[PDB]
Amino acid sequence: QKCIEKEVNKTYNCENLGLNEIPGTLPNSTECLEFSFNVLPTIQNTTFSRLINLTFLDLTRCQIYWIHEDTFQSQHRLDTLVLTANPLIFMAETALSGPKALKHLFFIQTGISSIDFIPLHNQKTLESLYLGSNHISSIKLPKGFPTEKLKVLDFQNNAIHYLSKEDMSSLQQATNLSLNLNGNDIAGIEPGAFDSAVFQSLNFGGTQNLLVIFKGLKNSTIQSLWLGTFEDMDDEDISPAVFEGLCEMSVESINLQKHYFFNISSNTFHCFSGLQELDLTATHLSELPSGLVGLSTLKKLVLSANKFENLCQISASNFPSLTHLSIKGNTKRLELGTGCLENLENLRELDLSHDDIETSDCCNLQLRNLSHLQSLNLSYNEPLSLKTEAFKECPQLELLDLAFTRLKVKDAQSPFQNLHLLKVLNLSHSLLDISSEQLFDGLPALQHLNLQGNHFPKGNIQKTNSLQTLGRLEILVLSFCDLSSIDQHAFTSLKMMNHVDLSHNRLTSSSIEALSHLKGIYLNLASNHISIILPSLLPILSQQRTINLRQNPLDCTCSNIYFLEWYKENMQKLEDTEDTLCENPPLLRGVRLSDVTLSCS
Amino acid sequence: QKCIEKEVNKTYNCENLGLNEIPGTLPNSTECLEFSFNVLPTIQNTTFSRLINLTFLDLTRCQIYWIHEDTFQSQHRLDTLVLTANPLIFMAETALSGPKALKHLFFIQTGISSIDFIPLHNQKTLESLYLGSNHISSIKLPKGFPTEKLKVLDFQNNAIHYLSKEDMSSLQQATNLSLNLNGNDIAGIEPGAFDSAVFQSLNFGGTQNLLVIFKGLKNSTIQSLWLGTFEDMDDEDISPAVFEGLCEMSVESINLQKHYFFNISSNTFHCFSGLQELDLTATHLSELPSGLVGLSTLKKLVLSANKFENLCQISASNFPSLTHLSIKGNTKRLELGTGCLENLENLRELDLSHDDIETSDCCNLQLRNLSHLQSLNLSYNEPLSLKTEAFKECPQLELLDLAFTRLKVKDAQSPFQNLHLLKVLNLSHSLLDISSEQLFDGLPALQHLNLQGNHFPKGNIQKTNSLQTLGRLEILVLSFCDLSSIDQHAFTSLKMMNHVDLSHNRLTSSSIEALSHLKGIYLNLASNHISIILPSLLPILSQQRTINLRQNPLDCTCSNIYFLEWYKENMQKLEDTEDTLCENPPLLRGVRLSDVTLSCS
Amino acid sequence: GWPKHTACNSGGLEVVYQSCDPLQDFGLSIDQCSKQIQSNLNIRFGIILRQDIRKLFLDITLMAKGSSILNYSYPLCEEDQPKFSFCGRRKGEQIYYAGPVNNPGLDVPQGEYQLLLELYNENRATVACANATVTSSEF
Amino acid sequence: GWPKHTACNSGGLEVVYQSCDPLQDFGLSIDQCSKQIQSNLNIRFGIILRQDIRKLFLDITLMAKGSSILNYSYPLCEEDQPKFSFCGRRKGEQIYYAGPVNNPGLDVPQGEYQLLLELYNENRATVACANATVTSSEF
Ligand SMILES: *[C@@H]1O[C@H](CO)[C@@H](O[C@@H]2O[C@H](CO)[C@@H](O[C@@H]3O[C@H](CO[C@H]4O[C@H](CO[C@H]5O[C@H](CO)[C@@H](O)[C@H](O)[C@@H]5O[C@H]5O[C@H](CO)[C@@H](O)[C@H](O)[C@@H]5O)[C@@H](O)[C@H](O[C@H]5O[C@H](CO)[C@@H](O)[C@H](O)[C@@H]5O[C@H]5O[C@H](CO)[C@@H](O)[C@H](O)[C@@H]5O)[C@@H]4O)[C@@H](O)[C@H](O[C@H]4O[C@H](CO)[C@@H](O)[C@H](O)[C@@H]4O)[C@@H]3O)[C@H](O)[C@H]2NC(C)=O)[C@H](O)[C@H]1NC(C)=O
Ligand SMILES: *[C@@H]1O[C@H](CO)[C@@H](O[C@@H]2O[C@H](CO)[C@@H](O[C@@H]3O[C@H](CO[C@H]4O[C@H](CO[C@H]5O[C@H](CO)[C@@H](O)[C@H](O)[C@@H]5O[C@H]5O[C@H](CO)[C@@H](O)[C@H](O)[C@@H]5O)[C@@H](O)[C@H](O[C@H]5O[C@H](CO)[C@@H](O)[C@H](O)[C@@H]5O)[C@@H]4O)[C@@H](O)[C@H](O[C@H]4O[C@H](CO)[C@@H](O)[C@H](O)[C@@H]4O)[C@@H]3O)[C@H](O)[C@H]2NC(C)=O)[C@H](O)[C@H]1NC(C)=O
Ligand SMILES: *[C@@H]1O[C@H](CO)[C@@H](O[C@@H]2O[C@H](CO)[C@@H](O)[C@H](O)[C@H]2NC(C)=O)[C@H](O)[C@H]1NC(C)=O
Ligand SMILES: *[C@@H]1O[C@H](CO)[C@@H](O[C@@H]2O[C@H](CO)[C@@H](O)[C@H](O)[C@H]2NC(C)=O)[C@H](O)[C@H]1NC(C)=O
Ligand SMILES: *[C@@H]1O[C@H](CO)[C@@H](O[C@@H]2O[C@H](CO)[C@@H](O)[C@H](O)[C@H]2NC(C)=O)[C@H](O)[C@H]1NC(C)=O
Ligand SMILES: *[C@@H]1O[C@H](CO)[C@@H](O)[C@H](O)[C@H]1NC(C)=O
Ligand SMILES: *[C@@H]1O[C@H](CO)[C@@H](O)[C@H](O)[C@H]1NC(C)=O
Ligand SMILES: *[C@@H]1O[C@H](CO)[C@@H](O)[C@H](O)[C@H]1NC(C)=O
Ligand SMILES: *[C@@H]1O[C@H](CO)[C@@H](O)[C@H](O)[C@H]1NC(C)=O
Ligand SMILES: *[C@@H]1O[C@H](CO)[C@@H](O)[C@H](O)[C@H]1NC(C)=O
Ligand SMILES: *[C@@H]1O[C@H](CO)[C@@H](O)[C@H](O)[C@H]1NC(C)=O
Ligand SMILES: *[C@@H]1O[C@H](CO)[C@@H](O)[C@H](O)[C@H]1NC(C)=O
Ligand SMILES: *[C@@H]1O[C@H](CO)[C@@H](O)[C@H](O)[C@H]1NC(C)=O
Ligand SMILES: *[C@@H]1O[C@H](CO)[C@@H](O)[C@H](O)[C@H]1NC(C)=O
Ligand SMILES: *[C@@H]1O[C@H](CO)[C@@H](O)[C@H](O)[C@H]1NC(C)=O
Ligand SMILES: *[C@@H]1O[C@H](CO)[C@@H](O)[C@H](O)[C@H]1NC(C)=O
Ligand SMILES: *[C@@H]1O[C@H](CO)[C@@H](O)[C@H](O)[C@H]1NC(C)=O
Ligand SMILES: *[C@@H]1O[C@H](CO)[C@@H](O)[C@H](O)[C@H]1NC(C)=O
Ligand SMILES: [Cu+2]
């Protein structure tokens, strides 16, 4: 009443319509059916039998109690089946006989206590099984169920407290398997259960005894081992002894978010020497001591959401090899100090966002000796003052993010001087005066400039301006800049622009003239003051690839007839035509231009 | 509608009627409402507010998702509330403000993962809480739940795997508590958690680690400890080692059913010396060794459903204190042997039912020396031949059950001779000839004799029959005895009879003459061939307290007017009057006699 | 009535049933069907309970060609012996059982048989009622 | 609209809400309500998820006397930081949460305030919407 046609003859959204059967009007060609929140107490061989082409079927929370014999008989092409949140009493042996090539099965919160609820003997190529939020107490798969193709096995939020050798043997044929045991408190692991085990991901989130984990995982090889906990768990402190078993396994990446380390000292991490990445998010760190051992070949470190007072309190000498450091969302003001990171010779990425950082001189002292640095994030901080050449210490920089950080720059100063490799610069809501004309000197390679929410004198972009020197610029964002006008020669020297966002300003059609030299662009003119678009502008629009004119006070009178005809013939080229409406005459106010046909002289 | 009125103004069964509200036709005085299997997606302050006198309310499987503020506001007198099998999303703080004297609450299979789902701060006198078949993983009671009157806490079929000191201290204010953990796989108990603990019952049915339980229960005092397993659980190896912890515990009664004991060590029960009762039902026992230490003061033993060949294989020398012994449903034919129980001098009750026991001469050899036996059950066995004084070895018997066991007794023999204290004798389907005058000699105290399914020569009870020696008889069951007639003097010596069941025979009305000397009896004549009851029999009927004439071919013509008039005058002497129907004339066939009035003049 | 379900079809033996409880259906699948029925079969079974199952009994009534072969009664749950982990569960609970039943071995002569299976409590109230047809053929 | 529920009525502070998601209601109870709200209150909360909650954000919009006091946003679940055990659960799942919310302490001046609380995913699709009245009065 009625299903939403998302793609003609292919994809239908029937959610929340209180339906008791597939609508007669759904075509036989349907491939993607979104049927969640309907009412199907029993499903059976007649239910879906005409929908022979389904590849995706979502029956989330459809009040299904019964799946009778041959229910999916016609779904030979089924790739994904979602049966989440149905109060299932029984599933017939031959229910899944049809979808022999099924890849992904979601059986979350179906009230089951065992995988043998689900007769899976017809699924020889399954890739994903999601069994979260049930009564399950064992990871063991049904004997003879093929696992060669299994990549994701997910048991989040179950009643699994023990992993046996026999449990694990049921998984041996899979390769690069990810096993999600998040929300299962592991009380024991059978010694030898993890002999020669290989996993892509292994998640034991929220588990209450880490000693059991590190001992139990002896001999396994794991890419990402997720051992974080949560705010609603009342976890015991981590004692140094807990990490001993890590000596007898191979792990690339470990997450320990929200834990509390008791008695942090020089040897606590000795067993971490093989680790490539360590994430210590929100672990109540107010400092780390130096002389810490076991972390000197670590590449990636996360110390976000902690409570350092000073960047020097992280003791960077511990991590000579780092290529990535994140320390974002520090719960106090992070004082940056001087050369506090100078040790990090090979640092390539630094994230210091949301750190309440405050300084009236930046950033050569703070970033001292970080000359391999390629990406810097200083977004969402307090006001920063930048003198000319403020990033002298980081000449190889390719991305610089200062979004939502107010910037204080003096007249004719060039803070980005000598950043000859910078490709991406985000200055959203930095509140710079963009008429300061040395502003962007030293940026020959810049391709992407985001200037959303900055300031232009009198809301005009002048014929000569600070953007002119940016010869390789491809992407320019000038939305929310309170622009009234753009001089027709403002952009003439920017010949490689292909994405120009001028949305949420007060522009008229005269602004289009500034794009006459460009072809094939994306041009966003949404939420401006465009009304009439005269014939002499139409060749400029015809030149572009996509144009967004939604939420403009478009004129739907004969005075705008050439644009209105152009619009009907150029629907390919137009984005959001559904929100592109007439302002006048009053009769046509709020009517889509796509629904207007005038007769003029 | 339409609710079944079980008790006028008091008790209504509205189960399975698809109701969305309480019917307006239910009186304000309703005290017991069975409302299961209806449809109440939300319940709230208006749902029940007029039913102020409810003491029992069952909302089992009513599709309730929401319980809002003050739902039970008017149920001040509520004793039992059943919310089992409702998919509850939330229950308001004040939902149970009304029933402050609530005693028993059932919240089984409601999907809850925590006891704090149920705001119980208003229930200060709670006695029973049933939380089975949920996602609960701890027994810990929430802060400020009164435990003082709590006697039953039931967690059958949950996800509890550990019992800590803290968990156990949350129960300290309760006394004499029965805690059911059947169907929870307990993998650990915190040392000290059971220090000084005192329980009525503790059930860990099905648990996979008996060693853990006994060790964890150190220092507890338990009246009944139920540690049986089930046919659908894995076996663990049983040896003396498993029971070591029992030596540091006080237990009155223990059940170990369905564990695999077969080929038991003589040292298996050395920790059981405090036990009064031991249950080894269906434990694959084929024999017990002599010198089976640790049970010399055991009082009650159950060895039912095992596989002994001979009674001598229980080695009764092991149990000199036994007062009760049950060995029923043995899976092989059991040979009783001779004197196999002779050292059980204290034995009072012996159950040897369902054992396929057969013998040419019972029961002096088999029961040799059981001089204190008071109750003996030999029901459901193969043919036993009894000579005169068949129970000389057990002169003190008070109850003897031989139901469904064929008895072979030579002409003029008195097998029950000198059972001067026997009060209850069940010979249902023993196929004895009840006309033999000597059959029941020696039963002066007999009060209760069940002879359902026996026989008399030619379906007639003669003036001389086996019963005339039973002067103290009160209860006589002669139903299904293929009886055509009973001589008027058949029961004349039986002056203390007050309950005579003659139902399911072919008796006609003159059978009533056999009860002529009796007053105030219960007389069941259901399913006979009584049609006409002539006036001279009516005074006999008037003398009695209750007569059942249901399912007789009763005559509702003028040929029967004297009885018909009597019937109307004496409804208070009649049982099952709603199934006491006319058979003739055809016009009145199936009409209740209570609805008949004739005029004959 | 309720749909006809197949519990079992292999090794020459086919078992088809219909719930004979007007109130509800139930699900049943039998593993390792054959004309030579092995002892202690594994089943899967799903149902809503209409009574508590502290005391639960099974009747079997077997016939072929319009006359009785066998009547049998067997307890599943009793106060003195709960045989299965599901014993003691209550009215309204959804039950799923996948496990053994401990039937005896038996060979099924070719032919067709009518089976009535009834689960009931101590008051003879219906817990489940199955009307089944069992077909044995050459294999 | 959905019923008005009382989340809280203690220590001079009353909190009444109404779900403003037309699709559904939700349950909420707050423990240790007062005019001097301590940090890290415990709540009890139940709902059906209408979106997956791998990414979950809260907006708070506060006002009094038709005047906007505070607009705040806060993430509950993110890829780089799931704060809660419920993070990652999926559309259709029934959720019950009984646990702490990591709120700051604060005294609440006498008067009547209007609160809009909104839980949404990365596409701003509604998970929950509560429209609440907070009344502080002397105690
Ligand atoms: C001495 O020892 C005796 C034996 O141990 C004790 O016997 C007990 O006696 C009482 C009566 O006093 C009786 O209680 C009633 O039970 C009703 C339910 O009964 C079910 O089971 C019985 C017995 O089954 C066993 O025996 C048969 C016969 O050999 C066998 O075939 C079975 O497989 C089973 O044996 C197996 O199990 C046992 C126990 O585990 C093992 O020990 C053994 O090795 C085997 O493994 C059945 O016969 C019943 O079925 C009949 O009845 C139902 C209707 O209820 C019919 O639907 C069904 O088709 C069948 O019909 C047959 O009999 C009826 C007559 O009953 C005929 O009409 C018909 O033609 C058929 O022939 C059941 O499956 C229960 O309903 C009843 O409830 C009543 O009372 C309660 C409360 O008091 C009220 O709620 C109700 O309103 C009722 O009024 C009552 O409780 C026990 O059944 C019986 N026990 C045993 C084990 O036999 C005896 O008590 C003891 N003496 C003393 C003094 O203690
Ligand atoms: C450099 O670092 C920064 C900062 O770390 C990175 O910033 C990220 O930038 C991306 C790209 O723009 C953003 O992605 C988008 O996210 C939205 C959802 O946003 C929600 O969070 C917003 C931010 O909230 C934080 O900050 C505010 C303001 O300071 C603060 O008030 C909040 O409390 C919160 O801060 C806290 O949390 C942090 C993280 O845990 C802590 O670090 C910190 O200390 C604080 O505790 C928030 O503003 C927003 O609310 C607004 O928007 C919504 C509508 O969405 C509106 O309803 C509200 O009222 C607000 O106006 C949200 O709550 C997501 O919706 C977007 O998703 C679209 O796009 C993606 C991919 O493009 C698609 O997949 C989707 O389908 C969809 O279309 C998008 O993902 C991101 O939010 C931002 N992250 C943070 C933490 O700020 C930046 O990426 C880095 N640079 C580089 C180069 O990597
Ligand atoms: C769905 O299955 C039903 C039930 O088996 C099928 O209906 C049966 O079809 C056979 C062959 O035509 C008939 O002999 C039966 O009498 C039918 N039974 C009933 C109850 O109608 C039905 O054909 C199937 N439908 C589809 C589309 O597969
Ligand atoms: C500032 O702008 C840049 C460029 O658009 C944003 O960078 C993207 O960030 C996302 C993660 O947020 C990455 O996956 C993309 O690859 C980045 N893009 C590029 C081109 O590198 C950045 O997110 C913006 N910052 C803020 C705070 O919004
Ligand atoms: C034989 O008859 C006797 C007497 O009615 C039955 O004994 C009763 O048995 C039950 C247990 O089934 C006890 O709870 C009662 O107390 C007994 N009554 C008396 C007076 O003792 C006995 O059950 C019958 N036997 C069979 C096999 O049915
Ligand atoms: C969609 O179905 C209709 C009717 O068959 C038709 O107009 C249109 O061509 C179809 N498009 C497809 C199959 O892509
Ligand atoms: C789809 O298939 C059915 C047969 O299943 C056929 O009769 C009909 O033409 C098709 N119906 C629709 C609505 O497309
Ligand atoms: C696991 O054990 C084997 C055999 O002892 C050994 O070859 C291998 O190095 C070990 N692997 C890991 C990852 O510890
Ligand atoms: C600065 O970086 C270089 C790496 O090029 C390193 O050799 C030197 O030690 C660093 N300086 C300090 C003070 O650590
Ligand atoms: C039932 O209630 C009515 C009140 O309408 C009363 O007249 C009647 O006496 C009651 N019946 C019994 C048996 O208590
Ligand atoms: C139920 O509560 C509503 C809403 O609070 C109230 O208006 C109504 O008076 C109440 N009705 C009863 C019977 O208590
Ligand atoms: C039944 O209760 C209603 C509402 O509480 C009340 O108005 C009325 O007095 C009662 N009816 C009778 C017959 O007592
Ligand atoms: C419990 O331990 C105490 C102190 O050791 C001991 O005296 C007492 O007898 C024990 N009680 C039981 C029931 O084991
Ligand atoms: C028989 O019973 C008496 C007690 O009545 C006892 O002293 C004697 O030992 C018993 N006989 C045997 C052989 O055990
Ligand atoms: C079994 O099924 C047949 C019809 O298919 C019917 O005649 C018979 O009465 C059924 N038996 C029961 C008990 O329902
Ligand atoms: C089974 O019971 C029926 C009906 O009561 C009876 O007619 C039949 O003879 C019994 N069958 C057997 C094989 O004893
Ligand atoms: C809050 O939001 C409103 C509505 O978008 C906005 O007008 C105002 O700026 C905000 N108010 C405050 C005090 O932050
Ligand atoms: C919210 O609800 C109040 C009553 O609770 C209503 O009067 C008001 O208009 C609503 N406001 C918003 C912003 O949803
Ligand atoms: Cu010992």
CSV table of C-alpha atoms in Angstrom, one decimal, chain A residues 15-16 36-37 58 60-61 84-85 106 108-109 130 133 156-157 182 226 230-233 257-258 281-282 305 328, chain D residues 23-24 48-50 74 80-95 97-102:
chain,number,residue,atom,x,y,z
A,15,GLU,CA,8.9,-2.5,4.7
A,16,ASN,CA,6.2,-1.8,7.3
A,36,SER,CA,11.1,-6.3,6.9
A,37,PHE,CA,8.4,-5.5,9.5
A,58,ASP,CA,15.2,-9.5,3.8
A,60,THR,CA,13.7,-9.1,9.3
A,61,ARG,CA,11.0,-9.1,12.0
A,84,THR,CA,16.8,-11.9,11.8
A,85,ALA,CA,14.3,-11.2,14.7
A,106,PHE,CA,21.5,-13.9,8.9
A,108,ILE,CA,20.2,-13.1,14.4
A,109,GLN,CA,17.8,-13.2,17.4
A,130,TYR,CA,25.3,-14.5,11.5
A,133,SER,CA,21.7,-12.6,20.0
A,156,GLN,CA,27.9,-11.7,19.0
A,157,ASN,CA,25.8,-11.7,22.2
A,182,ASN,CA,31.9,-10.2,21.1
A,226,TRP,CA,39.9,-7.5,19.3
A,230,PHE,CA,32.8,-1.4,27.1
A,231,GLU,CA,31.5,1.4,29.4
A,232,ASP,CA,28.7,-0.8,30.7
A,233,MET,CA,31.1,-3.7,31.7
A,257,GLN,CA,40.0,-0.2,24.3
A,258,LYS,CA,38.4,0.9,27.6
A,281,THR,CA,41.6,4.0,23.0
A,282,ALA,CA,40.0,5.4,26.2
A,305,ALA,CA,40.2,9.5,24.1
A,328,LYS,CA,42.4,12.5,19.0
D,23,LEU,CA,6.5,4.0,13.9
D,24,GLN,CA,6.9,2.9,17.6
D,48,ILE,CA,13.0,-2.5,18.8
D,49,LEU,CA,15.9,-1.4,16.5
D,50,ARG,CA,14.8,0.1,13.2
D,74,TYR,CA,27.4,12.8,21.0
D,80,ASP,CA,36.8,3.3,15.8
D,81,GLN,CA,35.1,3.3,19.3
D,82,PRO,CA,32.1,1.2,20.2
D,83,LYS,CA,31.4,2.6,23.7
D,84,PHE,CA,28.7,0.1,24.7
D,85,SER,CA,28.1,-3.7,24.7
D,86,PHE,CA,25.0,-3.1,22.4
D,87,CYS,CA,27.1,-1.4,19.6
D,88,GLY,CA,26.9,-3.4,16.4
D,89,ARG,CA,23.4,-4.9,17.0
D,90,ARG,CA,21.1,-5.1,14.0
D,91,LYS,CA,17.8,-3.8,12.6
D,92,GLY,CA,14.9,-5.7,14.0
D,93,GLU,CA,16.6,-6.8,17.3
D,94,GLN,CA,14.8,-6.1,20.6
D,95,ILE,CA,17.3,-4.3,22.9
D,97,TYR,CA,19.8,-1.8,28.2
D,98,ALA,CA,20.2,-1.4,32.0
D,99,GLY,CA,23.4,0.4,32.7
D,100,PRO,CA,25.2,3.7,33.1
D,101,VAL,CA,25.1,6.6,30.7
D,102,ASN,CA,28.2,8.7,31.1
